[PDB]
Symmetry: D2
Subunit: 309 residues, 4 copies
């Protein structure tokens, strides 16, 4: 049976003695566990992302597959960052739990089994970094937390899941078209920090003060959580238009939960030097802007990255 390595970033999701908390694991894989860090995923950050990507890239030859236990609140961010930076061609399957392991009908035990199932399936390779939640296999790019409490909260709300899991078997009927893992230029192996990218929210009577404080602090890039198709309130627009011209990378995304922020529709991106996020929501667009800045600062080149990854 396959060797699967579970990497923990926080508290347990089942019951390392995960094999005894969920004993059916041993029937389908030889499982070992390492505790890379122990934090709540709302405090997730750049430092954790780099050592995770380094650890998976380094240990790729020792194992057949990676399962990562992670909190749910930012799992969709870490999955996309790894989706872009992992160079290992074995499956990397992220999993968490919407109910705590010691509460009634806890979801983590079965989620973990299914995560392991997915990570040991030979059909799972070459589909990029995955998230396995509620009997479903979702790609790291599009998967997002959809509901604040529901066990079924994780959905790929724009293009759908890759496969459903029934009785330890996976019917895979899709694979992500955007370039992932190996197909990307991004290499973080020797980086110790990551370009500073903040996110500002748009609303009625919106303040430019948040955007201005990131401009003042010399942030390399800003992501706008626009309204509608990536639209900005006039104050925020002016502040970010100014900032664009003097070298800040500005990416128009949207607060709207589904749908692309499209190029040349509402906003002359070419005129102002902006970048349209596509279907990347603000926190997802941040992850790609961070990595884009490490290869080029040119707004047209970043846009092409946003259309390719």
């Amino acid at each position: 049976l396959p060797n699967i390595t579970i990497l923990a970033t926080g508290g347990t999701i089942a019951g390392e003695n995960l094999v005894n908390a969920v004993p059916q694991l041993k029937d389908i894989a030889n499982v070992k566990g390492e505790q890379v860090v122990n934090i709540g995923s709302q405090d997730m950050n750049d430092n954790v992302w780099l050592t995770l990507a380094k650890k998976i890239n380094t240990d790729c030859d020792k194992t057949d597959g990676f399962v990562i236990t992670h909190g749910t609140d930012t799992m969709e961010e870490t999955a996309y960052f790894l989706d872009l930076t992992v160079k290992c061609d074995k499956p990397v399957v992220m999993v968490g739990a919407m109910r705590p392991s010691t509460s009634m009908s806890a979801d983590g035990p079965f989620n973990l089994y299914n995560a392991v199932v997915t990570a040991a399936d030979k059909a799972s390779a070459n589909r990029g970094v995955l998230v396995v939640m509620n009997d479903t296999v979702l790609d790291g790019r599009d998967v997002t937390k959809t509901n604040t409490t529901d066990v079924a909260t994780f959905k790929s709300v724009n293009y759908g899941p890759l496969g459903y899991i029934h009785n330890g078997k996976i019917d895979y009927q899709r694979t992500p078209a955007r370039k992932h893992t190996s197909d990307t230029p991004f290499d973080v192996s020797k980086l110790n920090e990551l370009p500073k990218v903040g996110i500002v929210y748009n609303y009625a009577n919106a303040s430019d003060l948040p955007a201005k404080a990131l401009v003042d602090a010399g942030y390399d890039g800003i992501v706008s959580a626009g309204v509608g198709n990536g639209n900005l309130y006039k104050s925020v627009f002016d502040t970010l238009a100014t900032a664009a011209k003097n070298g800040t990378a500005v990416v128009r995304s949207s607060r709207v939960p589904t749908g692309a922020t499209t190029q040349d529709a509402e906003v002359d991106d070419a005129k102002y030097g902006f970048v349209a996020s596509g279907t990347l929501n603000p926190q997802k667009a941040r992850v790609l802007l961070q990595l884009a800045l490490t290869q080029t600062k040119d707004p047209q080149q970043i846009q092409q990255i946003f259309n390719q990854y």
Copy 2:
């Protein structure tokens, strides 16, 4: 037929210039329609002054007509409808309507949208249901309704509690009504008010900077709404700034960036400890609306929290 007043806030959503009665001629089958332009703005530039203008105007002219319809851009229609859901005291229907396609485009949605919005505003059964949004054959309550997709004509959905009724052939089969107190049944009164408490929104995400939150406390904002992660949780740096702010006067409301579901009281964050308010199903721009109006009522977090549980 009933008398219905159209209040435009921007460009026209139906073509073929405030006089939409020629653009959708079958409006005269259902109502006697008159129109005024109150402002003319892209909704992405919506603001407190427009909000106060709409509410005072509806409250004053209530006796003059049987119902209103407000044409509004879609980017922020969800914030305006909830603002009005809480300030309008006219018992008559107030239906907001927009268009996800330009009025000059193929299969422009505005003409049928406005038609259905007049149906709704003239329907006898549309009363006491609060301020409404009518889009794509659907009647939506002003609280729960939100813009779900960046481009889709079906974007507007009441994602937590569902719609109030569907509209087929100019008739509505209502089957729900918002149980939260609205319009008349609130204490919020803007009739003598000229400005609104300053309330900003801050986003949470991995490696989130405290700078945006600091700047709004440094500017002396009266409230801050957090677009938290998960069940309204907060990144470390942002937690520290907002916990400070909460004790030194600022009213902090914990909402969530997640598009559906409640931010509940003391799920994990101890709200009573830090003096926080949980928003419930109110997303960050919805929560800003109610906090703004609550701040005109009180400054104490425990009674702002009662307001978020009632309205």
Copy 3:
């Protein structure tokens, strides 16, 4: 604490044998729970006799307890809840609950589901809302609720009008109530009844055979529900058989195979011409329920149509 009665119709949905009080021990924090097995069947074998048993039992024992909870298989829980939504005359809460995972499996959902179903049945605020289904932290009205996915623990959704409230930490934030008349407010009375009118369902699709519909008219069925296509439209052969049937006594209800949305009156099919009834948002198995009970009230299509517009 309130007294709550569990009525089981099949296997146990929570383990660790009618006595579920040991399987979910925290039930004693919220209610005093007693249980009876009334039948023991896989829900795929649900039938009129079980339905009449449940309704008479609830109606007779109403005085004996403060609320019921019914454990039921998920395959047909949506038909039983709507049947009871129309026949139960007990004013007290009736909450149905099931499990999409076997009780012996990893992350079995039954134990927390039953817990939440007792919360709901004991909640004072759960009254007069009609017969309920509680699944996956959600309270759903008995009319609109349907099984949406073959396997998902979140399968049960009120797909046309949304849920009534969400359940967090044993409290419910109700925000809607079904406006359609239910329970006490109906005329349907099964207290003296021993059987139900025979009502079958027939499917529509391209190149559909008339044979299934013919066989139920040949068997003398009292009603036939059509799972039409689109807005309750009918394949040619099936149209002809059912139009014949409608005039020669048989009551035909046009519903739709499409999982959401109303089959409306005279969208395209001239219902008054052929003597048809349109089902509204009632899917084919929901429509069978109401037609069955309407046939015990009357046989005339125009007044069956009023019933489909009221209940």
Copy 4:
């Protein structure tokens, strides 16, 4: 500009003078139209399906792409049948309209443009037969009518869309994994009828009489619209179990709108000689059972077809 051939099966959806009903078509393609038949799609049937597949296969060399105007009520059935029987490698794009062409804010004009856009995109080839509705590109297998009146009713409810259409451009991020068009054995070129397959509905107190009438009439195959994961009411089960043994092909699908009817879960398919429909809903499962019967009658061989197509 590409040559696109519009094939009409019923009434117009815009306004052959479709070029003058929607004049923006001429800017993006050279369009001609033929009226293959004129019926309401609720009366759609086997005869129409065969001549359509024959016509598309025959005329494949004359044009660059096919657009088919079709009623909405059965569009999801015809799209999957063609998805399995078209041998032409140019795009075949089905489109209809949820609002009539002469009513306010009619959807057919813009749907038709987008259908033409999709049919002329070189990126659309090799994705099987498509359905284009409400700015979305959906694969013929999974696409289904979701709502009785909504313009947005057509959704791929299990695996998601292939791409979204904005301003005449398509971001394709998925392609169907199941075998389609050329990759299938099915060839209808010389067939003049198709094996008889009926569908029976399951519910509480369900009658076996419908199933029995199709058994009596010697139907080659039955599709069960089960309850839950493909479950049958005891009468229907017995009738179909008997029928299975004496040569009828029985396929367990489900009335439930999303989710697979999976093998060996609720029902011993091997014991009774049944076939599990997977994610094919009853009307979709009928289309594959019809075509499966033309290559083999063996329940195990049909099951493998249901796992491959």
